[PDB]
C-alpha cells in the first residue's frame, strides 16, 4: 500500500507542512513524498527512526518514495524547514515502541507543538 504525502509551503496547519503529517503504515508499505511546492525534501531525524531502520534523505524538489520495513515511529523533517516545524510522523505497525522517546526528544518548540497535535489527533 502507498500513501501520498504533499510537501507544502502552506497548509491547514500553517506554513511549511507535510500533509498528512501523520502516516499510519505497515511493513512493506511505501510513502511517496510529493513536493507540491519547491524547496522541500524529506530526511529521517537522527535517533527518531526505529532501531534498525536505515536513515534517508531525499534531494530538494524530488519525488521521494520511502519503503517502510521496520515497525516503530519515524519522525521525518523537511531539511530546510525543520525549524519552522515541517515534520511528519510515520507510525509503522501497532504501539510503536519508540513513540514516547520521540515525543520526549530534544526538538524545536514549533516542531514539538506540531508533533503533539498530530499525535493528539491519532
List descriptors.
alpha/beta; metal-binding; Immunoglobulin-like; 36% strand; 122 residues; electron transport; copper; 4-stranded mixed sheet; Pseudoazurin
Explain how this protein is built.
The longest helix is centred in the last third of the chain and has 12 residues. The protein contains 2 helices and 8 strands, in the order ββββββββαα. It has one domain: Immunoglobulin-like (Sandwich), CATH 2.60.40.420. By secondary structure, it is an alpha/beta fold. It is globular. The strands form 2 sheets. The chain has a 4-stranded mixed beta sheet, with no helix packed on it. A 4-stranded mixed beta sheet has the order 3-8-7-5, with helices on one face.
Helical fraction equals: 10-25%
Radius of gyration: 13 Å
Protein structure class? alpha/beta
In N-to-C order, the SSE pattern is EEEEEEEEHH
What is the CA–CA distance across the termini?
20 Å
Subcellular location: Periplasm
Keywords: Copper, Electron transport, Metal-binding, Periplasm, Signal, Transport
GO molecular function, one term: electron transfer activity
Function: This soluble electron transfer copper protein is required for the inactivation of copper-containing nitrite reductase in the presence of oxygen. Serves as a direct electron donor to the nitrite reductase.
